[PDB]
Design a protein around this ligand. Sequence first.
Ligand SMILES: [Hg+2]
Ligand SMILES: [Hg+2]
Ligand SMILES: [Hg+2]
Ligand SMILES: [Hg+2]
Ligand SMILES: [Hg+2]
Ligand SMILES: [Hg+2]
Ligand SMILES: [Hg+2]
Ligand SMILES: [Hg+2]
Ligand SMILES: [Hg+2]
Ligand SMILES: [Hg+2]
Ligand SMILES: [Hg+2]
Ligand SMILES: [Hg+2]
Ligand SMILES: [Hg+2]
Ligand SMILES: [Hg+2]
Ligand SMILES: [Hg+2]
Ligand SMILES: [Hg+2]
Ligand SMILES: [Hg+2]
Ligand SMILES: [Hg+2]
Ligand SMILES: [Hg+2]
Ligand SMILES: [Hg+2]
Ligand SMILES: [Hg+2]
Ligand SMILES: [Mg+2]
Ligand SMILES: [Mg+2]
Ligand SMILES: [Mg+2]
Ligand SMILES: [Mg+2]
Lengths: 416, 411, 396, 405
Amino acid sequence: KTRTQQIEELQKEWTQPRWEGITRPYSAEDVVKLRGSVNPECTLAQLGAAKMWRLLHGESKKGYINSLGALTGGQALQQAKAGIEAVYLSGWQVAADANLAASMYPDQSLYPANSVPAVVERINNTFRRADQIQWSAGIEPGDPRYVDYFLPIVADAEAGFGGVLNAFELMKAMIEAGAAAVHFEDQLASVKKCGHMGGKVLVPTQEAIQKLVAARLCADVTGVPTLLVARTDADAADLITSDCDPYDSEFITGERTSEGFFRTHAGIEQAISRGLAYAPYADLVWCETSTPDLELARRFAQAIHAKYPGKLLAYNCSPSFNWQKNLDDKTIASFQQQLSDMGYKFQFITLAGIHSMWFNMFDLANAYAQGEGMKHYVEKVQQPEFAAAKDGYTFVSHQQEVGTGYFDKVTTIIQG
Amino acid sequence: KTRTQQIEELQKEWTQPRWEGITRPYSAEDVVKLRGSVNPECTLAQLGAAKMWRLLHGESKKGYINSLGALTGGQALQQAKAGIEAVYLSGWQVAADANLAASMYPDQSLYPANSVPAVVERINNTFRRADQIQWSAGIEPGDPRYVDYFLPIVADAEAGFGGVLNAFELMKAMIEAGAAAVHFEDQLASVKKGKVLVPTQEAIQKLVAARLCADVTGVPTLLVARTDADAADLITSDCDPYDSEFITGERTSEGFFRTHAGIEQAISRGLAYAPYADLVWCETSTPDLELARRFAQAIHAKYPGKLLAYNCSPSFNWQKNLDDKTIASFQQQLSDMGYKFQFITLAGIHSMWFNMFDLANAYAQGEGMKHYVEKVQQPEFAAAKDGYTFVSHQQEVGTGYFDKVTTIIQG
Amino acid sequence: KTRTQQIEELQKEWTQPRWEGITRPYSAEDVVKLRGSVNPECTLAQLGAAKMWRLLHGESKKGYINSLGALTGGQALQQAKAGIEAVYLSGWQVAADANLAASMYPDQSLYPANSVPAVVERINNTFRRADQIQWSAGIEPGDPRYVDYFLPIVADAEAGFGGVLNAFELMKAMIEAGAAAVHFEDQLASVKKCGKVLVPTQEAIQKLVAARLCADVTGVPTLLVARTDADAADLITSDCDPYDSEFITGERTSEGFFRTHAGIEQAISRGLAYAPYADLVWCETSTPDLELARRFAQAIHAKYPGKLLAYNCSFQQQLSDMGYKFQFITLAGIHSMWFNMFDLANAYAQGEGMKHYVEKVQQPEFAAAKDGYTFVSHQQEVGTGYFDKVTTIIQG
Amino acid sequence: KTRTQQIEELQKEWTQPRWEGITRPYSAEDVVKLRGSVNPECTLAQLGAAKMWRLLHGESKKGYINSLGALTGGQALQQAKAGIEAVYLSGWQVAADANLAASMYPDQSLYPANSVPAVVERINNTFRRADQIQWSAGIEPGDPRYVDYFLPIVADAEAGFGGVLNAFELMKAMIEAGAAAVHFEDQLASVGKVLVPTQEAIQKLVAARLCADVTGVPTLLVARTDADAADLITSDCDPYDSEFITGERTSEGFFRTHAGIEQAISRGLAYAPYADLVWCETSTPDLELARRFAQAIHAKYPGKLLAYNCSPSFNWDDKTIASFQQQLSDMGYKFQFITLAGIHSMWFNMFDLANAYAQGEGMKHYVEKVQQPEFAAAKDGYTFVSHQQEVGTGYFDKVTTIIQG
Ligand SMILES: [Hg+2]
Ligand SMILES: [Hg+2]
Ligand SMILES: [Hg+2]
Ligand SMILES: [Hg+2]
Ligand SMILES: [Hg+2]
Ligand SMILES: [Hg+2]
Ligand SMILES: [Hg+2]
Ligand SMILES: [Hg+2]
Ligand SMILES: [Hg+2]
Ligand SMILES: [Hg+2]
Ligand SMILES: [Hg+2]
Ligand SMILES: [Hg+2]
Ligand SMILES: [Hg+2]
Ligand SMILES: [Hg+2]
Ligand SMILES: [Hg+2]
Ligand SMILES: [Hg+2]
Ligand SMILES: [Hg+2]
Ligand SMILES: [Hg+2]
Ligand SMILES: [Hg+2]
Ligand SMILES: [Hg+2]
Ligand SMILES: [Hg+2]
Ligand SMILES: [Mg+2]
Ligand SMILES: [Mg+2]
Ligand SMILES: [Mg+2]
Ligand SMILES: [Mg+2]
């Protein structure tokens, strides 16, 4: 395709409804000059981004997408079998038990920058195998047992691991691996303040914006309409690294710490001002929260929507607290539905996969180690599995689940 | 430390009780010429082997070690916290969800040969973090709240991924990562159509190559010889006269020779591998007591006290029969037969995959937070009384430890 | 695309000239059932295959492709700049200084099976960068200074590291990483007893088939090179294949291997058996011998006229006339690297340090500039200017 | 070993000559509390650190150590056979052709942080193999042909890839892989170059020293300053920098400073008490410029080890070109190195070879450019002529032999 042809096709694409309300501080010619003469296709990223966009605009089963953090390809596989519509890939879970340094870390961006994309690839590879198994058995799209295994993957890009070029390279790796959406945040975890009423440190609004622009540019160069999730940690961060951006002057207290940080007035107002600033550069806005407060959620949503009506929002929980300690059972039950009616169409439990995994190993192990080992394995795992069969669980047939049937057909064809 | 002194040491070490009944077809001098002038220490491998040996000879709580396959450092950590004494690292689980090709594979040796070792390192790194957290908090060995995190790791080396040098290099990767014990099998999974065995002498050479690597590194790693002869009715060649009684003479189109699958063949291989390994294992698909008693009696008629290992996948609805009473005492009856190391190979993957399915099937339907509270958070809070500490997730992964490191540096 | 539709597109493509004379023991239907509902695009593999084919059928500059083994993306970069048309990726070099076990090994298939594909990926990434630098600076295709950086990569899959499924997975890795051609051999390197050991003919054929099936499943027309080590191997693992009976003496070794009559006659029967399943046939050799080369070629062409051959290295022109259209020195990259490092360091260690660096490297680099060598400007070569543009665009 | 014994041994060790002039803002008890009850041995790191220290204190052949940037284990191997006493591992070379993202990058800390440590491991493994070959052939320390393959490795940690914890973890990976020395800098390539406040740069040097102490290995720490060409600084939080801070702030919010040898010297003097070596990065080779820095450093810290580099992006009179490294040695620059020697050697020669080869009469140029010169060099110690042996074919043949009885 000629350069001029590529420029014209982009200019036209940015007029499409997918890009309504999105701001780009660069031109189509800027994008096309960074591509090179050959631009490799990223099939899974293309499919994931398209699918995610549709689910967020009327095709989800419940009107909203609710996800659970997953740290292995196999956890994501079971989610797809259970009916989950999008996979959430948590950086925290990766730091603790699935990173490339092969170490257990706390959530402070200590792992090698290419660790999340590595997990994205594992998940997509698992999805491909399942799809192959299914296709080779002749079960085709639109069959009474046809499971669509390619769930869009939402991945945690932390703060980009450095400057704008670092965020640019990480975005590229996420896309090449097949992620459907990526989230960037405005706190600098690498410099969290120690001691004295310390905590998370924000970067100036402008710096956080350049990272979103860096991720959008990389996406545009590759030609995939990847969803960009702008996250703000300003609700709880009362420290900023600098006062260079006039937009933040109203939250700057004047006091300075020994590191050179400037104190700010933390709270929903600062969160709202970050939310509004990132809105035109992202497809989804997320305001990090630590408590299940429906009223605060409404307020945050109303504020963003007064300026950007219909803007898509995301809502999380780790969860770090005891929901039952904070709320009554009926509110716990209708929590996600209420959020959805406020505009939170993407909701998730960030650490569900690790809590699920670690707790169940502990539970089985604890009984097993005391004796009567096989009875515990039978009562805690096998019996529950047989009962789950009715619901779509097929791992009871463990050889087939991992491709044994698929590879047998390969073998038979080769020696055919 | 010089060559002669190294030679002298080895010779003396081999007269120690650890090596009783063990045959090595080479010399101490052969071992030392393969070492180099500098031989890096393997602290974790050393500690795990010595501990694993002690547990198998009287220091285990129940008289036997019962394990569960783990595929993440975190699963292992929870086992350590629950009182498990050794970690079993299954090749099947790695092929399915934790290998270096980042792909889901069936159990046919398709993943890159350095994958199990990578998981060993992950596990030991998880244990190193837990131990540091504990130590930083002032809790030391002897202290009643001290938890010994360095559980010996038993790893799956399949058939070595090639010839003797491949097996030699794999053993080496295993030891440098810190495995305490390693198992090698006599089937050739790269051709599973049923299972296919290699000649008895070929299997023995792989065991020899593994033992040689360990002696070169200088670590007493435990070697587990596994035989798949109970289910293998094919052999690659008739070159070994030891195998002639099971070879009928019939050859298949692939050039393989038919044999007679059964405990008789299993017994023959077990007897041949015995003098070369610390433990002997006859892989089974059916957890069957009479079969197990028959195998152990056979081995023990010839090598009294030989330590055995027993596994189960286990197969679907296997308990479908044995009465509940046989199911509950199953592991104790085995221990009395000599099976001191028992393990459920796919426990970890079943545990993980099923629970994710269970949580997600309910959550995808609605009332999402209720299901999370009822299936996870509530049960977690109730297990805190038993030693589960992940209820406080930030402390578990080292936030407190690293915050302290930051503090020492800043001030 | 529909299953049936996919099946039809496959039947039709197998009638095209690209596949004349190639045998496939399976059906299109078989191929399609293994694909899945989604088959990711492999852009670089497609381009590499299409280009390697065209170069072998009239578009090379000299009527033949001569390559040099490369072990780093940078080495490949310099080759592209100097005018080479195809990159040769040696497994021996990978085993010695570029494998995923991070160790130095002899050539005995000791390294992790995904190691070669990892280097294929590095080379392709280096090429993408050079291309981006050139494109971002305006130089477009057809420019009097435009260098086509996407050189087809020929990579060594050894014996596929195990059975038919491992070869299948290895081929998949090669293709996903962007290889244009891959070679499989009939010796079992993991068993070189204290010479070479061949596997029955049917076994080597099963691997060629597995390799071709994966390429067909991916939809990429990757070139498959069948290599035979039978010219020097006098040992075989088994006598199960009737086709090999005439070379088998009956003598058997302590390992249970059968002695065979090695020589060109053994190489010719393997060459002939593999011909229909491969795009190129290669009978590995150690010394340049035109008469031997002429004999192997006449024997293959008597049954498969036109069959392209590969030649492990006016010498070159006659070979080319005989059909040896792909010629290469497998270990050039490592000899080039280690020798020059030794040269430079030997002198440097003695004294007059900067003088030796200037005469052995700087001066010569300067003279090189006139021939298309651009690394004298190393900040630019590595993309400092490309990322400068990225930065500039993001910040305004 | 007891917590108490550990603290005690640690204290006595800090009074040893290895540590004179070095400041540690933390106590022995702090170190031991971060260790864990089991502390795995780091054999290669111990050997390389001890050896590097000895070389720098009289045991080198020429009075100074001159190195060349290497990016593959094989390149290091040839340096060992060539007489080089220390291996230099450049981050620039790693960015361009040997990083874990498998991509070619400019030198702006864009590659995965565990990339350099991965190359350290490759180099040490190659050395292990070369040593095994030798030992298995009966050759031992003292044999007229015995080569000491374990050269200390000097490795580039750039700026630690983040905050103090990233720097801590990076150092941990360098030591576990077996590096003998590591360099950290005060610029922010992630951001001409921008410097960080002096206290921050120092915090990274302490983070690295702390990890080494916890591991129990006396690793060498090289403090590098980029202040000779840096006119920007991220903040004015450190009074120690106040005199170079002009007052004019940039649009990014960075502050302008007065760049020059005077800036480098103050960074140089501020890092001295925390590093084992001090290095003031340089673009142009000026002896006088190098003399002022050295003298200036020594006024306050007599006999402080200094390091000096050459890209050389340059284009170097012949007499001064030939005595250059001899003169620096006299100023106190005991560790000298050509950072990109490795990549230019490799890339240029492949260009030279391929260029000739592509034209025609290929076999001819290969023989003339590589093979003939290799035979000629065998005389001087080059052994790759016998390539099967160099990589261990003979060592693995012995293994096979012992195994099959
Ligand atoms: Hg892509
Ligand atoms: Hg603090
Ligand atoms: Hg990009
Ligand atoms: Hg600013
Ligand atoms: Hg919020
Ligand atoms: Hg939530
Ligand atoms: Hg070790
Ligand atoms: Hg070893
Ligand atoms: Hg035999
Ligand atoms: Hg059995
Ligand atoms: Hg069992
Ligand atoms: Hg692909
Ligand atoms: Hg394939
Ligand atoms: Hg056969
Ligand atoms: Hg030949
Ligand atoms: Hg040649
Ligand atoms: Hg270590
Ligand atoms: Hg450390
Ligand atoms: Hg400061
Ligand atoms: Hg300087
Ligand atoms: Hg220099
Ligand atoms: Mg996160
Ligand atoms: Mg297994
Ligand atoms: Mg090869
Ligand atoms: Mg550097």
